[PDB]
């Protein structure tokens, strides 16, 4: 049922989303049981200085919440979006020196992806920070 | 022993620079023997997955080079500035609920400072990424 529901979405991504959910410096994956510990770090700055481990730890915390809140029926969808927005705010594109750029990773369950197909289709077309902020703004309904 | 040079700098900072070297999301200190090892991390990812450690290691690496190359006479100033650009490029403030809008930290030798005071005044009154881009890339003087 986990594979079975994951399979339909992965087939649906192939069919209608051209094999991917890449958006603006961020892509979504659709998995029933993600290996979230494989996406973590162990990070200490010594001698009490913000080296940037916090930024890392915050990113992991938010990816986790974005998944866990997606993996249940009926979570507040605007509050979910606000979490994505905080992730997006905290992301800082690892642009490999020259003119290269990379994508932040987020994960959502298959049930959630398939309750929100139109939304994930728009996600892919986001082209700026300014559009992104508008797209993720917490509407009432 | 080598404080004499630092204090000559600290006196000029207080006297002629309003007591700081803050610029556009970044700050210079002037130190003869900085404790760069204090300003460090020991952190790793798990998977092949880039968890954001690479950006921190790069930051330290560049910070240290920025200091070491300032700590001798006659280094290629344009190339020195090139390191500063790569540092700024690789920097990003941590953002959660707008504020805070924080500063990166660089350190430079007393003598390097005292041979480029004029350049350091211009560094302060930068206030955009494009002003930063131009100021660092354009042949000085």
Swiss-Prot record, chains A, B:
Site (Involved in the inhibition of host stress granules formation): 133
Region annotation (BC-box) ranges: 3-12
Region Interaction with and inhibition of host AGO2, residue ranges: 93-101
Superkingdom: Viruses
PTM: Might be expressed through a ribosomal skip from one codon to the next without formation of a peptide bond.
Binding partners and assembly: Interacts with host AGO2; this interaction leads to AGO2 degradation via an E3 ubiquitin ligase-dependent pathway and may block the RNA-induced silencing complexes (RISC) activity.
Function recorded in the entry: Suppressor of RNA-mediated gene silencing, an antiviral defense mechanism of insect cells. Inhibits siRNA function through the direct enzymatic inactivation of host AGO2, but does not interfere with miRNA pathway. Facilitates viral replication via the recruitment of a cellular ubiquitin ligase complex that promotes host AGO2 degradation. Inhibits the integrated stress response (ISR) in the infected cell possiby by degrading host Nup358. Stress granule formation is thus inhibited, which allows protein synthesis and viral replication. Does not bind to dsRNA or siRNA.
Protein name, per record: Protein 1A
Annotated organism of origin: Cricket paralysis virus (isolate Teleogryllus commodus/Australia/CrPVVIC/1968)
Full-protein positions shown: 14 to 154 of 1771
